[PDB]
Design a protein around this ligand. Sequence first.
Ligand SMILES: O=P(O)(O)OC[C@H]1O[C@@H](O)[C@H](O)[C@@H](O)[C@@H]1O
Ligand SMILES: O=P(O)(O)OC[C@H]1O[C@@H](O)[C@H](O)[C@@H](O)[C@@H]1O
Ligand SMILES: [Ca+2]
Ligand SMILES: [Ca+2]
Lengths: 485, 485
Amino acid sequence: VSEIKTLVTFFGGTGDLAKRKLYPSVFNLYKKGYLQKHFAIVGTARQALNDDEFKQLVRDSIKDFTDDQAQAEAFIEHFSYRAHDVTDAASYAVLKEAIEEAADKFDIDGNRIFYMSVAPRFFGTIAKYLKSEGLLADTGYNRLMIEKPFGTSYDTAAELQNDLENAFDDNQLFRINHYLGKEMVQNIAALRFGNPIFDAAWNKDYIKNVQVTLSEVLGVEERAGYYDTAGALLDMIQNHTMQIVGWLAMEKPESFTDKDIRAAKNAAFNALKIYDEAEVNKYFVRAQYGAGDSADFKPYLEELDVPADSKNNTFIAGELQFDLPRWEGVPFYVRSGKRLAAKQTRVDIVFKAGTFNFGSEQEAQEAVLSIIIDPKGAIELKLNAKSVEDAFNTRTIDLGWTVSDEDKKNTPEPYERMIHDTMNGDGSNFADWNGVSIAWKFVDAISAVYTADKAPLETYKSGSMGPEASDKLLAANGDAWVFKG
Amino acid sequence: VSEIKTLVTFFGGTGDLAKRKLYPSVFNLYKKGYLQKHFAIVGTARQALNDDEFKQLVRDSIKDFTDDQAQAEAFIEHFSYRAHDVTDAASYAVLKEAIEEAADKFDIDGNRIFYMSVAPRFFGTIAKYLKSEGLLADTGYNRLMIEKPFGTSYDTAAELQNDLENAFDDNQLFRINHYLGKEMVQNIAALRFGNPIFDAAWNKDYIKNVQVTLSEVLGVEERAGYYDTAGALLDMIQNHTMQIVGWLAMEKPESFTDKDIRAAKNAAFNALKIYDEAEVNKYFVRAQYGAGDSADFKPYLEELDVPADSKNNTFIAGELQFDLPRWEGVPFYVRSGKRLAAKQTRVDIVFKAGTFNFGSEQEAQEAVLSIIIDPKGAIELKLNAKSVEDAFNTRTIDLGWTVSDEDKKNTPEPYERMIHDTMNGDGSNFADWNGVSIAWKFVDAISAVYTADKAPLETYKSGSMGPEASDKLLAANGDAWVFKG
Ligand SMILES: O=P(O)(O)OC[C@H]1O[C@@H](O)[C@H](O)[C@@H](O)[C@@H]1O
Ligand SMILES: O=P(O)(O)OC[C@H]1O[C@@H](O)[C@H](O)[C@@H](O)[C@@H]1O
Ligand SMILES: [Ca+2]
Ligand SMILES: [Ca+2]
């Protein structure tokens, strides 16, 4: 394979994320022969640990992925550590030492990635000092991987963007969105543009409505403290949902380079309508899970760290509208919630029913292209065919495909993808500023109404697919949710 | 169900066909509650048999379909017989007696079907006398079911049509084509017109080529005597293949009535090009099966009743061209042979590869809509998607659907369909004169070259999918056979 010559500095290199996802993902890239000799990993955090102590943390991190110990050790030799506080301008010279030390040790000509696996409050600070204290490579490239969340509103997001642009150009900024890193999500473009029958049908003339569903069976359980101010709206809608919707709504690009892809996606984002109070109440539904049937499924209000009077949303459902010629009048439905019927991340393209009359008792119904992303990748197509009856009549049948075990096992985890992409300088599977700003602008209009409590808070039985209002939402346009559970 | 009040007269009612297919198919229609009180079946042939003797023939015919004996007997009471020679004008009064006897006995107001399950030489004769000797109902309808083959060339077919039109209008003539009676073949129209994504793509702008395959693993074995002068060309191509091609090539009808359907099909038939000697050699391949690997698979030349110097075709492959705006430049490939790799009656719609460039090592390939008719009904769609690789790349995946056992078991046999349709007066699943004449005109041009031996006779290993020339046929237009065995 072609060797990837890069140097990655992990801010928050002792954290849970670095141990669970980051390091093993890097190890996988090494096992696959991508990272060979010319690469180094510099871990950093406040806590002091000498190289020997750090390497053990790295060793444990990749234990469940180690099959050949000698291979693990060869990899560990590329790791170094330095205790350091990010708010200490002077302490950055220490870090610069380590980085330049590693650069010489493995003969890495520039090419530096700075992964900020730290709390958001440190994002801008770290950036300023990466430039001012001279940590940025003078050759190759310099890329900054920003962890979730990129802001908590448009203002905060915009401020963050300003602090970061002081040291980097937007094309050097790789914000983390793990849903964009999911293999199945990257199939959307291949299915659409790769098959003229679908490419030519990806518009208002053929499609009735589009559906994006991020269903989870888990409750808040653990992280209520943080989740009580974020809700489904910011936790899953603003980031995950909106960026998938962007892959679907995008115009047809001039080519498949991240640049044209982004331009095409932005063409749709700039067309997305932002709602006012009256419209939020019209096109959106916010809900909170109550008890299920089992005692084990207690209401949201009884979860650890949840205020007894919380009006937070554990479920969101809504209709997006793109004022683009190609999507004129096509509803884009999105939903995401906790304590639902099943875990399911899927996209449903519902085509308009044909108008040809067969004379049958059952005329043509809506065809559906379904792309299942989680739990297991699958592609299904509901088509109109003839029923096995004496009198001519139509009926829908479901064509199906599912990933094989060879596919399932060779599929890279989102984090391995994102990192690998950043090293390659490919922004296709990353949201740019324009996408994020609009996603926030859109979500902020909704949040404003909820914060002001000028919209209803529906409820739902823990284990259903949401409040009934979710169904009535679609019914108004004569639509229904494809996935029922 | 709505009662079907009809009276059917079976010419050749002692024959193998009447016993194997005809009678049981009628019994099924009775079991399904369609035929109730007002119906009668008059069997006829030269051989003398009294009612008691005939009913036993009918009883044995439906033995393997009898689960309730009392039900079988109730059905048998509707049968009568009369010995009769079809060339005896005077003996027709006897038959008229039986028919009118049955008509009174079961109170059937007209509605008569005359099934000619006799050798072709008797078709015209029987027709003349049905009219002249007054056997045609004066009320209701009168329909004539003509068994295969309807002619053996255009001239003979045209003569037959003339003799029959002396007593019937073309809309009363129901020629037997059991392939049109196959449930899956009737799905073509539903899939196409019932799904706009396919309906809008059923043209030269989307499709690369169309493929019809009637593959058989059986050799001539039994009927070589008849088969040696018919060959694959007339045995499977002229009738079965051509009429399926008609369901695919047809324009889009004004409605789904047999009239508009036929008009649409004829729009294509009238556009079909007829070849000359040079063109037959260019667009067609004729072959005869040689030995396989196993001794059991002996060459055609060693089959019972096959002349040691026979140049007969046990396999045919060819390219059809429709000079219609919508099919301009779209090849229609057809193939049918004996001693092939597998039994398979399927249709493959190969769509053009998309021209969008992804930059991948593997660009978009041709999508394929496959409709499998025999052995088991299935619908498959080969689509372009993303491969499970690190570097973005496309790959084809196969979506699939297969008939359930509920479908398989509730699906009516071709003969039951054809009869049931004739009683309903529905000609949708029947070739009209226009279709048959053109089918013959097309086949005759080819036969002329073969008879004159001004075209090569290829050969193939018993068990392959044909001679290599079959592959080279498609390769010339940059195509290949979807089904490989
Ligand atoms: O569906 P996945 O990829 O496991 O992601 C689900 C998780 O996605 C995270 O982004 C959310 O913060 C969590 O609340 C959620 O549970
Ligand atoms: O494929 P099916 O429907 O069994 O039909 C196959 C038969 O069809 C008949 O029409 C041919 O005369 C036979 O030679 C052939 O074997
Ligand atoms: Ca509406
Ligand atoms: Ca050609």
